[PDB]
Design a protein around this ligand. Structure first.
Ligand SMILES: Nc1ncnc2c1ncn2[C@@H]1O[C@H](COP(=O)(O)OP(=O)(O)O)[C@@H](O)[C@H]1O
Ligand SMILES: [Mg+2]
Length: 291
């Protein structure tokens, strides 16, 4: 079948004249770059805080995750545009409160709802985290004993999930994974919600820089093909088109959720990279149709 929802958001990175224009009159989901008009589900200016961005874009997915639906939030775009910052890939301990990203905020709300529903509980719920890195189209388990050893025919499921009981634990897995981490390197930190009969995932994806100079991009790219193939029901999904779509195969299924976060530079010198990132958003936006 089709995914439950495919959403696309854009976040303007802080300015160091911005090429990004937010029209005086708009629905808050539009922007203009190099005279081109872009329309997505969310358009966040450089002034949007982490809290607001998380509340608008990710918080809604928390209930879905708890209900058993697979969820994926993926940041993409040029290096230095705030992808890691937005997703919260840096160990929480060494981060100021207002700067905390999506990962720590999501985990916080997950624990809260799990503790609030652990009495009108059917079964018990346990939370875990996995940290996978894709270096040159090769999956690596950053939480295992061989973080520098490629995976095959098992990166889809067989990969260490470490227990999560508090933010401190998240800090541990992020610190551990970061150390065991080694010309593109993508990161996929997944919050796993497991019960005796259910397993839902919240995949927080932080892709490597999309700038140029199979083709650097290709994942997400491959992601759009997957989204389309499912809609038109090609009765064969190109999951193996890339390591990204292979690792997230279990999450790229019917009544799963996919949310894109395009991070863009407001600098004129990055116009070309920004346009590339926004054009991809438009394409993923069209592929999200029929879903
Ligand atoms: N919205 C923001 N608010 C404050 N600082 C930011 C913001 N976005 C990016 N930064 C800072 O800019 C730098 C690069 O952010 P980063 O996420 O590492 O870019 P990327 O991961 O896309 O290559 C880091 O210092 C980050 O804290
Ligand atoms: Mg980064």
């Amino acid at each position: 079948a089709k995914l439950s929802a495919v959403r696309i958001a854009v976040r303007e990175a802080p300015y160091r004249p911005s090429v990004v224009q937010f029209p005086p009159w708009s629905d808050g989901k539009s922007l203009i770059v190099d005279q081109n008009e872009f329309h997505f589900d969310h358009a966040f200016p450089a002034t949007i805080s982490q809290d607001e961005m998380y509340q608008a874009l990710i918080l809604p997915l928390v209930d879905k995750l708890l209900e058993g639906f697979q969820c994926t939030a993926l940041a993409y775009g040029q290096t230095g545009t705030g992808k890691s910052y937005s997703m919260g890939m840096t160990p929480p301990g060494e981060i100021l409160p207002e700067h905390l990203g999506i990962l720590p905020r999501a985990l916080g709300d997950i624990f809260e709802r799990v503790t609030a529903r652990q009495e009108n509980n059917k079964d018990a719920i346990q939370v875990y985290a996995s940290f996978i890195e894709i270096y040159n189209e090769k999956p690596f388990d950053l939480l295992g004993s061989t973080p520098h050893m490629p995976m095959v025919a098992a990166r889809c499921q067989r990969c260490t999930c470490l227990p999560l009981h508090s933010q401190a634990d998240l800090h541990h897995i992020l610190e551990l994974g970061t150390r065991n981490r080694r010309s593109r390197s993508h990161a996929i930190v997944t919050i796993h919600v497991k019960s005796k009969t259910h397993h839902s995932r919240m995949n927080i994806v932080d892709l490597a820089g999309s700038e140029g100079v199979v083709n650097i991009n290709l994942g997400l790219l491959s992601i759009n093909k997957v989204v389309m193939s499912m809609a038109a029901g090609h009765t064969v999904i190109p999951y193996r088109d890339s390591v990204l779509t292979t690792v997230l195969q279990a999450s790229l299924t019917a009544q799963s959720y996919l949310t894109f976060l395009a991070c863009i530079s407001p600098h004129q010198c990055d116009l070309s990279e920004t346009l590339s990132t926004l054009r991809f958003g438009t394409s993923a936006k069209a592929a999200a149709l029929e879903h």
